[model samples]
Every structure is written in C-alpha cells, then in structure tokens.
Target chain A: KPIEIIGAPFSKGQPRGGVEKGPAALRKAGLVEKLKETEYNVRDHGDLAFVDVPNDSPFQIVKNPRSVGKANEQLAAVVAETQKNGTISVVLGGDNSMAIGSISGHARVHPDLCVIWVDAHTDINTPLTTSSGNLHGQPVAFLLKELKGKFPDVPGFSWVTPCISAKDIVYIGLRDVDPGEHYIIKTLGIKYFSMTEVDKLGIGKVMEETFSYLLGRKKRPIHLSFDVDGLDPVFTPATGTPVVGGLSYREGLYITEEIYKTGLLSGLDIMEVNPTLGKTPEEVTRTVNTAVALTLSCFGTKREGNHKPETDYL
Target chain B: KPIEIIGAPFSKGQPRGGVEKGPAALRKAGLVEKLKETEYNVRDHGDLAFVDVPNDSPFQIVKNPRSVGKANEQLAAVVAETQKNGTISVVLGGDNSMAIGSISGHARVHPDLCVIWVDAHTDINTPLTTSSGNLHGQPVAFLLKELKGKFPDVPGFSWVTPCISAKDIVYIGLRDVDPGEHYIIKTLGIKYFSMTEVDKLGIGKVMEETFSYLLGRKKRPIHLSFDVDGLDPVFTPATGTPVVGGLSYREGLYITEEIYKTGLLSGLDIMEVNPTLGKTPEEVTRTVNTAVALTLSCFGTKREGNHKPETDYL
Candidate 1:
C-alpha cells in the first residue's frame, strides 16, 4: 500500500498553538526523506487548515467544543479519504484530539481495526467527568463505542460516529490517569499497562501480552496512537503534559519496531509534540528528533552512532 | 554493612578540568541526603586532594603519568581503608581513571573480586596500544593481571600491581573500542557484551548472562566500575567521549538493582561526570543527577515521580 502523510494542524484541543506546529517541525526533521528511505510509495497530503469557528463556546465542561470538533471532523474526512485511497495513513497530530478523527476515519473503511494507544493518560475522560476539559485529553471517550451515551451532545461533533468498541483498544504507558478515567478503565476491563506494570514486567513481556490479548485469536489492522507525553520528559519535555517515569525512548522504539514487524498497522498518529513548550533549542531538538525517530522506526530502522572508529594503533 | 562515601576529585585522566568537579556536582544534587534517606549507616570520607607533581612528564605516550598515578594511589588507600572499616564503599570519581585506584584498592581487600565494568569504552588500551593516550580510557589495562607484563614500566604506575585476571571481569555497554582494545579483549578470552550484543540480547538477558558467567558457581564480591558514559549521551552528555546508543537509564538502574540483590556488590565507582563540559546547566544536572541516581540505586533505592495524582472528578 502507498504510504499517506497527512497533517492535522489544529491545536485548539489542548488550548495550545505550539502543538499546531508539530507537522512543520516533523517535516523539518526530514520525515519525508525517512519515509522514502524506508522504501514506501509516498503521498504527502499537505496539511489541513482548520476553519475558525466564531463564538464557539464551551459546552458541558468541554472547552473549544465546536473548534476541536470541527477540526477533527475535517481530519476524519481526510483520513477516510486516505483510507479509500488504499494507503497506510501516517497522520501528524496537532494534539491527541486528532485521534478522534483519525481513528474514526480509518474505522469507516477497516471496521475491524484495533487501537494500540500509547500514552501517559487514558485520554478517555467523558465531558461529564472532565476536570481538565481539554479536548486532547478526552478524544478516546468520543471514539470508544462503550462511551457513546456517557457524554452530552457538544456542538460541531454531529458528524463523528463512535467507531471502535472498548475491546478493540489496548492502552500502554498509562500513569497520570484521572480518577474517572481509572475507574472507567477498570469497570470496562480495558487491556492496559500502567507504568507500575511496566516496572514489574519488562517492556518485552508487556508488549508480548498486549499483542496476545489483542491478536491472540484474530489478526486485524492496528491503529497506533502515540502521545509524546507517554515517553519520559527527559526525551520529550516539549509535549503538553510532561510525565516522568514513562516509557524510555528505547522502549517506545521497540514498540514501534514490533508494531511495524506485525505488518498490521493501517494508520498511526504521532501526537502532542509541542516545539514551543521547551525552555531551550536543545530540548526542542530532542523532542522533535525523538518523535521523528519513533516514526522512522515504524517505517525504516534506528541508527547507532560509533564515535572515533578504529585506527591502526598496535 | 555500613556505607562509606569517598570522593576522588582529580581529573588528569582526560584532557579536561570539568571532571574534577564531578564530586562537588553529585554532592550538590543531594547524594548524601538520599544516602541517608536510604537508611544506611553513612560514613563520609572527605574528598582526596592530590598534591601537585612538579614538571610531571608523559611516559610512552601516556599523559599526566605521575599525576594520574599518584591520585589513584591515594584513592586506592582510601578505598582499602573503607573496606577495612567494614563498609560497602561508594566512591565518587573525578574520572573513570580513578577506577585504576578504586578497583585496585578494592581488589586488595577482596582478591577474589570480579569487575562488572559498565562503560562505553573498555578503558583497557595498553600504553603501547593506545591511540588516544588518555589514562581515563585505559584504566583496565593497568589493573588486569594478564596484561601486567605486556608494557614497559611508567614512573607513577611503579607502585601499582596487577589485581584481577582477564576472566575476573565482564564488560557491558562497550561500543567505541579501539583496535588494540578489541584485540586485547578477543585474545584474553574476555566475556564482553558490546552494544551489538546488547541489541541482539535484551539488557535483561545480557545482565543475566553477566551474573551467570561470573557467579554461577562461586560467589564473590562485585566491583562495579560504572563510567557515566556507559549510558547514552542523552543522560550523561557532560561526560568525556560519550558513545551513543548505550544503556537506557532504566537498563542501567536494573543492572544496579540486580547487582545490589546479589549481595556481592562490595564497592562501586560512579565516574566521569564532567560538570563544566555541557553547553547549558540543564545538561549538567542530567549528567550529575544520572550519576547520583545510579549510585543511589546501588546504595538505597530509586524513586519515580507521581505527577499530579488523582483527585475526585466524577
């Protein structure tokens, strides 16, 4: 399948603008070059321009409801179109909120798709339970079929349909979960690996179990939605929510490498890398490079640098 | 056993002064506080002061011979004294070259001791085989019993004796090895896991193999000479001669935790954190804190941050 590169450059989901700059930063880090290097037929779909919603007001504890809704609604159509094009969609996110549209759109075609959401939080807070009210933190709720009637109707989301069932999703790297989110995960029996589990069971074991639970009986498409905050702040401090003790960079890379090896990934979202959030350029580079490298691992492979190679000495 | 903390604050090993500041940086980052928090009987042996050697000259391409040699001799005495005092010694280093003294001093007390050398470079280049001629990168050559007769006598090293044999050591995290060093390892039939081996077998397997290779039959004291550069430059960028794709922070932590569990960790040297090398203060703390944290993992424990714990929301 041809590889589709689409950018969802709207950040109203998190009340942040730097996230909107994620696509540009990734492209600047040679994403396309690496995509080509990975030996894929490339189609750069440019970026989505989110239309401004005038007088869009918060509804039922949802901030920027209309704006976040409309932007993702636009993203949904683009992703669906890419799926129809018979391409593997690599969506660059403005925030995790884009997963609402990306997953929704991908599921429209591949209804049997399973999501492997790698994030520090479940991002599954309902409008009724949202304390942060950031749409970015609530995208999973809008997509999970189990959470359909739990939220009141918000403006601009009339087009979105809940796509995946609760069982179709597996979450990894959950640490900073809200009380409501945690309770919902337990009640719903979500296959999730918290950082504690990751600490107890090595990442290799955690990943193996993740696959066994999801693909043990049936093999279907995998939708990887990776939030940068799922990684430790040491590697990606520029993300909106800086979580410590998250997955190490190698762990994150191993996840991608294994996902790519399965040949089941139909769509992915690399989200929450905010270039403007860091205190220095070095941090910004680290964040951008980490995201780029993770994305590359899904496509090509990782490189290890050898400093001062051998010379005749004896 | 009670814990003993000794500082070796001499940095003539590599061609820099920033490393001499390592002890101060680690202490400033609350090494003692966490040491006490780990509930150990703490005995702080003050930093060593190596008196100046007037007009010290190089011997057979080895730089700062008398200075490096004299400083390590001083450190060896301090370490041996700590061992006699019935303590698990935690030696803070100005450079990895201090391992020449730390391991040497340590082996005197426990002649059956084995070294778990965690470093990017083997630090085993003999004076005759050295291309860089940096003492920090060649401490292993001076300590291994097999290589004792392989080189001409240098002025300052006259007092030093060969301690551990080749089979008494196992190397982890080796990537940037010199031609001579690689040959030495190959000929001496040393047990080493290069970054290649680390990539092939996970760190879990690598460490398991390390312990099984060393202590599968007979249990003895473990001298862990951990050069900060054993970690990728990401965590210890302030260290000299950093090789990329080394152990992750968690991998390094796991090594320490497992070593501590073996009840064989007699002494450890946390080395090569150069405070004055980084371009920014942030880089410096990442390096210093990494060293301190690894040291703490050996002595007491490691703590993960709980960011924004749950509150009632539903």
Candidate 2:
C-alpha cells in the first residue's frame, strides 16, 4: 500500500505560533524521501489551506472554537479524500486538535477504525470540562459518539459528527490527564496504559496487551495519533507541552514497530511539534529528527534491520 | 545491614583521564547525604589512594596493565574491609577496570557470591584477545576462575587469585560486545540477555529470568557490577564510552528495584561516571544526577514513593 502525506499547517488549536510549521519542519527533514526508501510510494498531498475566519470568538470558554472547528472541517474533507483514493493517510499537524478531523475523515471511509492514541495526555477533555480553553487538549471529546449528547453544539462544528465509540480507542503514555478527562475515561470505560502501567508492564508487554485489546475480536483499521511530548522532554523539547517522566526513544519506537506489524494501519497524525520552542538549533534538530524517525517507523522502517526476501547474500 | 561507601579513584584501566574523578563526582552529588534519608547508618570511607606504579608498561596488547592491577589490589583490600565490617559495600569507581578488584574483594568474603554484570560491553576480552589496549574492557576475564589457565601471568597480578567462575555471573544490557568477548561468552555458556534479547523479551521478563537463573540453586550473595554505559548516553552522557540503544532510565531503576528486593545484595560497584567528558554542565549534571539516583535506588528508595508502615494515626 502507498502513503499519502497531508499537512495540517493551521495552528489555532493552541496558543502557539510555530507549531503550525511542524509540517514544513518534517518535510525539511526529508520524511518523504526517507519513507521512499521503505519502498512505499509516498505521495505528497501538500498542505490543506485553512482560511482565516474573522470574528471566530470563543464558544463558552473554548478558545478559537470557530477557527479550530472550521479548520478541522476542511482537514476532515481532505483526509476523507485521501482515504477514498486508497492510500494510508499520514497527516502532519499543528496540534493534537487535528485528531478530530483526521479521525472523523477516516471513520467516514472505514467506519470501524480504531485509534491508538499515544501521548503524555488523555486529550479527551470536554469543552465544558477544559480549563485551558485550548482546543488541542479536547479533540477526542467531540469525536466520540458516547459524548455526543454530553455537550451543546459549537458554532463551526455543526457540520461535523461524532464517528467512533469510546471503546474503539485505546490510549498509551498517559501521565498528565486532566481531572475531567480522567472522569470521562473512567465513566466511558476507556482502556488506557498510563505511565504507571507502562512502568509496571514494560513497553513490549504493553504493546502485546494493546494488540490483544484493540485487534482481538475484529482487526479494525488503526489510526495512530502520536503526540511528540508523549516522549520525555529531553527527546522532544520543542513541543508545546513538556511533561516529565515520559517514554524513552527506544520504547517510543517499539510502539511503532508493534503497530506496523499489525498491517492494519490506515491513518497517522504526528502532532504538537513546536520547533520554535527549542532554545538551540541542536534541540530543534533533535525534535524534528525524532519526528522524522517516528514517522518512518510507522511506514515500514524496522529498528533492528529491514530484510526483504530479495535481499540476498553470497 | 548498613551501607559503606568506598571510592576507587583509579582510572589507569583505560586511556581516559577524567574517569578517575568519578568517585569525587559521585560524592559531590551528595550521595552520602541522600542515602542518610533512608535511615541506614551510612559511613563514607572516603577515597582509597592508589600509589603511582613506576614504568607501568602494557601487558601484550593491554594498556597500563600494572597501574590498573595495582589499583584494583588496593581497591580489593578496602572493599574487603568494608564487607568485613558487616556493611553492604557501595564502591564508586574511576573506571569499570575497578570491577576486577570489587568482585574479587566481595567474593573473598562471601565465597558463594554471584555477579549480575550490567554493561553495554561484556568487558571479558582477554589481554591476548583485546584489540584496544584498554584494560577496562577486560576486567571480567581477569576475575573469572574458569578463564584462569587461559592467559599467561601479567605483571602486578601475581598477588591476586581468581575469584568467581563462569557460572557465577550473568550479564544484562549488552549491545557493544566485541567478537572476542562474544566468543568467550558463548564458549563459557554464560547467562546473558543482550539488547537484542532485551528487545524481544522485555526488561521485566529479563529481570525475572535473571533471578530464576542466579537464585534458583541456592540463595547466594549478589555483586552487581554496573557500568554507566549500560544506560543510554542521554541519561549518562558524561561517561567514557557511550553506546547507543542502552537501557532507559526507568529500566535501569527497575533493575535496581528488583535487586534490592532480593535482600542478597552483598556488594555494588557503580562505574564510569567521567564528569569531565560532558561538553556542557547540563550533560555532566545529568550523568552525575543519574548516578546518584541509581545509587539511592539500591538503598531503599522506590520510584513510586516509599511507604514505611509506622506512625499511623488513622
């Protein structure tokens, strides 16, 4: 199967300037060229254009609700088109808020798609429950059908519909969950592996259990929504949120390796890479380079080595 | 049992200079003061001074064999004294070469002692087999009784006798092993979980297997010879030789936690800090801070907060 790269270069989800440039930084790091070596015929769909919406004020304390909602609406259409064209959608993001559109668009095509949400956060805070007003922290709330009746309709999201059920999603690397998000996860009975669990069960076992839970009955299509800050701040210092005591470079890659082995990957959203947050050029390179490696892992790159049957020796 | 700290401030094992300062760096990181919080009567035996060996020439391809041998001889005496005093010996190191002394000294007191050698390299290259002249990489060869008749008498080692046999040791976190070391390990049938196996089995399972192998026959004393390079350089960047794909901070601590649970830790050697190797103060601090934390973990500190059952008012 081929990969279609979709860039979400709009950044109204969070109060950050440079995260919108995550797409360019990823491309500049030669993500497309590197994935080409993985034998995937990757096509660059270019960046989706998110027009500026004036008077798009906050809706009940949710900042940029209209800009974020409208932008995701456009992202949803582009991702749906990518899926209809029969390519694995790889959407680079401005913030985690892009998951709303990415998941929505993919579910439109494959209605039974499941999500492997890897991040330092649950990112499931409802608009009524969010404290920071940043829409990025609350993407999963709008996309889950279980929470559809929980909140009133926002101005720009009237065009969007909840696609997946709560049990259809599983979270990994969750250490910094908001109280409301915690309550929602518990009430909805979402399967999650917080850092505490990740610590108890090593990443390998965790991945084993992840597959057992998500793909046990029916192997649904996977949508990997990875937040860079799911890793330790030392590895991803350029992200908008820097949580302490996260995954290591090795553990992070292992998650991707296990997911790629499943062969049911349909969508990917690499989010929250704020390159400007790095104080030095080296920090920036480290973050961008990490993003590149992680993206490549999802395609076909293996950590040990890639051995094709055609690869012969004397 | 209480804790005793012994400093082996001798670094002639390798071609490095700053590694000798490892003992001082560990002490300066407030290792003693921090361990005091564990309610263990901690005593700092200070650093053992190694007299400069005159015209210490190389033995075959081994570099500074005399200096390293003489230094370990003195280190062995101090470590022996600490163990005899009924204190769990915590020996800080100038280099991994000091393990020749640390393990020998521990086994001198407790003849049934087994070793859990955690390092990126096997450190088992014999003097004849070593390509690099660094004696630090060949300490285990000098200590193992099985390989005793294999090598000729090196200068300054006439005072010492072999201590532990091949079956008395198990290695973890090995990825940078040399060809010679690999052959020695396989020929001896040593119990080892290399990074490749660590990736396959996971650290939790690896530790379980380590305990089953070492503690299965009889409950023998344990001597953990941990080289800092066993950890990825991001956590200990100021080390002498840092190999990539080493253990993560969490995995490293988990190893310590499991060992501490055994209550059979008779001796410990934390080696290869090398503060001067860091390009920045942050890197040096990261390495030193990590060493301090690892040492503390060996002494009753838990990652998920310690809970002592006392002074209950409920």
- The model with the greatest TM-score is 2
Candidate 1, residues B94-166: lDDT per residue as tens digits? 8888998898888889999999999998888888998876888788889888988899988798889999998
- Candidate 2 at A116: error in angstroms? 1.9
User: Which candidate's lDDT is highest?
Assistant: 2
TM-score of each: 0.62, 0.63
| lDDT of candidate 2 over A141-253, digit per residue (tens) | 98888999798888788978888888888899999888899999999999999999988978877898988888999978999999999999988899988999999877887
Return the clash pairs for model 2, or none: none
**For model 1, what is the alpha-carbon lDDT of residue A256?**
92
Clashes per prediction? 0, 0
- Which one is best on DockQ? 2
Worst 10 residues of 2 chain A by lDDT: A305-314
Local accuracy of candidate 2 as per-residue lDDT tens digits, B1-314:
78989988888888889988988888888998999988578888888889888888777787777888888888888888878888889989888889988888887899889999888888987877788888888889888878887888888888678888888889998867665666677677899887756876878889999999989989999999889999998899998899767898999999999999898988999999898999999999999998889888987899788865795757
Candidate 2 C-alpha RMSD relative to the actual structure: 7.7
Docking class of 1: incorrect
